[PDB]
Design a protein around this ligand. Structure first.
Ligand SMILES: [Fe+3]
Length: 329
């Protein structure tokens, strides 16, 4: 048997308010979680996740093969050279089970200065036809702002946990420029399930996605109630229990860099499960030019022997590296 990872449920509601002592007590919880397995569930987050799951299902189950080509990223459709990040990520029956749809900041419009300048990692979102998916685009853009709000509150908690003022990260996380993404992932039930879409870990576990650290500052993740994630600890890989009422939070490798690995980016992997399910991450990314000066909360003077890294450089290279390591999703 596999042991259960310690993933505490933290009521994050004080991070939306003005009770500073209560926010400090949340921050302590975040600190403890981040120093232990690296994961926690945010509860009392205020987001309607049941509705998110329903609207996402309505999309995944009604989009057609024609629409998927028309929305496909460059990796699947050579005609779409501008779509590196945003669009549809196709399955390959008999070979690849997963499929997904990614979108970015809704404020990246054709007139946005970074779109005009053609700065890497910024793209204008692509959407299906409104008549075929009524309400979907509006729902998805409002969800971006709902989970942006939750993420801003969680960043106040991380900042306080590290001994900083509450806007230490959130001042870099702004609606006009954030590189944050939503990915609506469909993991399907398949009968038969093709062995080619199943990877095997060194310890024999059947996987859908191999070990990795997240390319993010933090990751704010909703998933269906099907257990699938595992975290590497000093005691081996342990199962993260599902909670389809909460958001699963962890740090990405930008947080590890900034904190000199005091808050590690936990290594985790996705087990293969033959079940129809959803995995809906929001990757909390800063702006392209955002630079946080690294520090070390374990050293008396707080200094670190790491160099500042702009977020845009981090993200463009991190996303390419993750594809190289674990495959195009
Ligand atoms: Fe991950």
């Amino acid at each position: 048997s596999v042991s259960k990872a310690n993933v505490p449920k933290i009521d994050v509601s004080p991070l939306f308010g003005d009770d500073q002592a209560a926010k400090m007590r949340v921050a302590q919880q975040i600190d403890a979680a981040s120093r232990d397995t690296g994961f926690f569930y945010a509860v009392n987050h205020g987001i309607n996740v049941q509705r998110l799951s329903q609207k996402t299902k309505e999309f995944h189950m009604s989009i057609t093969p024609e629409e998927k080509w028309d929305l496909a990223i460059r990796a699947y459709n050579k005609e779409h050279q501008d779509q590196v990040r945003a669009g549809y990520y196709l399955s390959i029956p008999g070979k690849k089970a997963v499929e997904s749809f990614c979108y970015l900041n809704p404020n990246f419009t054709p007139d946005h200065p970074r779109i005009q300048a053609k700065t890497p990692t910024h793209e204008v979102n692509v959407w299906p036809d409104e008549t075929k998916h009524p309400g979907f685009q509006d729902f998805a853009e409002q969800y971006y702002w709902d989970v942006f709000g939750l993420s801003s509150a969680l960043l106040k908690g991380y900042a306080l946990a590290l001994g900083k003022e509450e806007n230490f990260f959130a001042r870099h996380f702004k609606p006009d420029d954030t590189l944050a993404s939503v990915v609506l992932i469909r993991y399907p039930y398949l009968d038969p399930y093709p062995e080619a879409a199943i990877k095997t870990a060194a310890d024999g576990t059947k996987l859908s996605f191999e070990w990795h650290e997240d390319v993010s500052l933090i990751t704010v993740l909703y998933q269906s109630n099907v257990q699938n994630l595992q975290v590497e600890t000093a005691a081996g890989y342990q199962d993260i229990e599902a909670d389809d009422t909460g958001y699963l939070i962890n740090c990405g490798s930008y947080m590890a860099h900034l904190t000199n690995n005091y808050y590690k980016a936990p290594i985790h992997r996705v087990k293969w499960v033959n079940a129809e399910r959803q995995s809906l991450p929001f990757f909390v990314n800063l702006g392209y030019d955002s630079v946080i000066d690294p520090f070390d909360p374990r050293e008396p003077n707080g200094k670190s022997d790491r160099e500042p890294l702009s977020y845009g450089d981090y993200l463009q290279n991190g996303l390419v590296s993750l594809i190289n390591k674990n495959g195009q999703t």
